[PDB]
Write a protein that binds this ligand. Structure first.
Ligand SMILES: Nc1nc2c(ncn2[C@@H]2O[C@H](COP(=O)(O)OP(=O)(O)OP(=O)(O)O)[C@@H](O)[C@H]2O)c(=O)[nH]1
Ligand SMILES: [Mg+2]
Length: 238
């Protein structure tokens, strides 16, 4: 890995095993959910519960209540993350009202299942992630200051691929390709063409590691289904 990743994983080593809330920063596809899964499985207690991922930017207002609090039957995300870790991706995309309901769950430590009269305690580790400048959203009143100061305790910054550099881009590409083709079959084929890795290293990935994994999956499947490195087929993919 590069220096950015080693520093980041060092932060993870320091801060994984404790109950404090974590806020992850980074562009789309840098690997924020992977980091949250790391934090989950390096927690000594919460590792035994479920990892519950939630994209707050794909929840329609009509279903927020059902999806988060459940029904008296449906189990919401809070109760699904009992003894585990809740990953709140795109937390900045929450509307203000849903921000307030979340902060009230976080402060009181309980949820009311829709259609119930007694609230039920809840215990989970909170990892939230955003790709936006949350403090500046708070200055504009698009994000609530109470929720922010409750979320933004352990802050981690996940580097982009352009920050990680060409050596890390090429190593990620190669391990993804090897995972798609099989290291043993890769051994029985020609070497990976140099123009391919050069092209990878000199390309900008807006989608960061998601986009790069997609490219390596297309490459690996082409190789797997044709039995070699077709330069026309591969060239089409760049
Ligand atoms: N091997 C490996 N895979 C990685 C690494 N970083 C990211 N990935 C993978 O690349 C993809 C990135 O997806 P996520 O981790 O969910 O990305 P994200 O940053 O949460 O994206 P957003 O949902 O847009 O915030 C996944 O398939 C990850 O497992 C890395 O350092 N090593
Ligand atoms: Mg995600």
């Amino acid at each position: 890995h590069s220096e950015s990743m080693q520093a980041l994983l060092h932060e993870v080593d320091t801060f994984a095993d404790c109950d404090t809330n974590v806020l992850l920063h980074g562009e789309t596809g840098v690997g924020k959910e992977r980091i949250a899964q790391l934090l989950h499985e390096k927690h000594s207690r919460y590792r035994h519960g479920e990892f519950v991922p939630v994209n707050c930017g794909a929840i329609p207002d009509g279903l927020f209540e059902s999806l988060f609090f459940g029904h008296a039957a449906h189990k919401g995300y809070f109760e699904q993350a009992a003894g585990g870790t809740l990953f709140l991706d795109e937390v900045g995309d929450l509307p203000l009202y849903q921000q307030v309901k979340l902060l009230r769950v976080l402060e009181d430590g309980a949820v009311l299942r829709v259609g119930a009269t007694a609230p039920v305690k809840v215990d989970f580790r909170l990892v939230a992630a955003s790709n936006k400048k949350l403090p500046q959203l708070v200055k504009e009143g698009l994000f609530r200051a109470d929720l922010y100061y409750r979320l933004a305790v352990i802050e981690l910054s996940i580097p982009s691929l352009e920050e990680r550099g060409a050596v890390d881009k090429i190593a990620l590409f190669k391990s993804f390709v090897a995972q798609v083709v099989g290291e043993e079959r890769l051994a029985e084929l020609s070497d990976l063409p140099y123009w391919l890795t050069d092209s990878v290293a000199d390309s900008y990935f807006p989608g960061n590691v998601r986009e790069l994994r997609n490219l390596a999956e297309r490459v690996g499947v082409t190789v797997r289904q044709t039995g070699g490195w077709d330069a026309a087929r591969l060239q089409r993919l760049i």
